[PDB]
Amino acid sequence: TVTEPVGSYARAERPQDFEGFVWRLDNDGKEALPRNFRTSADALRAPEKKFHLDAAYVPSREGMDALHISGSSAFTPAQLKNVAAKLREKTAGPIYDVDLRQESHGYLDGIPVSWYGERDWANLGKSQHEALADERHRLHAALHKTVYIAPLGKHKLPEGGEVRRVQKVQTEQEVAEAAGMRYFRIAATDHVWPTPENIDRFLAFYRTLPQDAWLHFHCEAGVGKTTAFMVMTDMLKNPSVSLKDILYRQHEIGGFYYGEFPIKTKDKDSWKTKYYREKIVMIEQFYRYVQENRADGYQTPWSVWLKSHPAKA
Ligand SMILES: [Cl-]
C-alpha cells in the first residue's frame, strides 16, 4: 500500500507552505521574442555538456517537418504577436497557444505577471477548476488597485521592480486571441512531472486537433513542462521513432534532455533532484503508453493505464 505512486511524488508536498506572495514579472519585454523560442522545423545543434550526450550522434528527422510544434518561455502581448507571425509563415492551420501554467497569471497594464509562491507552487494541489478560479479572482481584484510587480533575484525573492495602479487587466486567453491564436490551458505545476489529469486533458485535446494544427507550448521559463509536452506530442505523432531520437532531437532544437544524465544540483536546489529522476522514469513510461495503446486508438486513457501499469523508481 503506497501513498503516492511514481509520477505523483509532488502530491506529498504541502500546498499551504508555498502560497503566493507577490506578482512576479514573467518577462521584461525587451526582446522581440520570448526566451527559448524553438520549432520542430529548426536545425539541430550540439547538445549541452551537462547532459553527457553523444554529440556525434545524428538523430532521425523522421516526422519533424510534419510535427508542427514549438515552445518558448512566458511572454508579453507584443512578443506573442511576433511568435504568431513567425509561425503563420510556416503553416495555414490554426495556431494554438498551449498554456501549461498552473500558477495564476495574466497581464496588468500589458505586463505579463504571475502570482508567485515559493517554487512557483502557489496553486499546488488545486484542481484545474480551482486554479483558474483563483486566477480569475486575483486578476479582477487587481483592477484599479495598487500592485507591486518585481522580477525575482536573490534566492528567488523580489528584487526591485515597480509599483503601479492597474488600469487594465487581461487573461492569456484574451492576449492569445489578440495575436490570432487559439487557446488551450493545462494547469501543470512547475518543476514536476505533469499529473495524470494534466496528460488526460492534453490527450483528449490532441485527438480533436485538425491535421494542420500547430501547437505552441509554453511555461514560465519554457524548458521543463514545455519540453515534456513537446516530447509527448512528438511520440504520439511519430510513434515509429525511437525514444533516443525523440529525446535527442527535442533537446537539440533547444529543449531539455529528458533521458538519463548526471543530475548535478546546488545545495539550495537539492529538492529538485528527485523530481528530475521521477520525470526520467515517467518519460519512458509515457513512451510505453504510446507504443502499447496506439493500435486500438488509445481506448484506455493515460491515467487509467498508468494505474494498472505503474512505473518503478
Ligand atoms: Cl474542483
Ligand SMILES: [Cl-]
Ligand atoms: Cl517546469
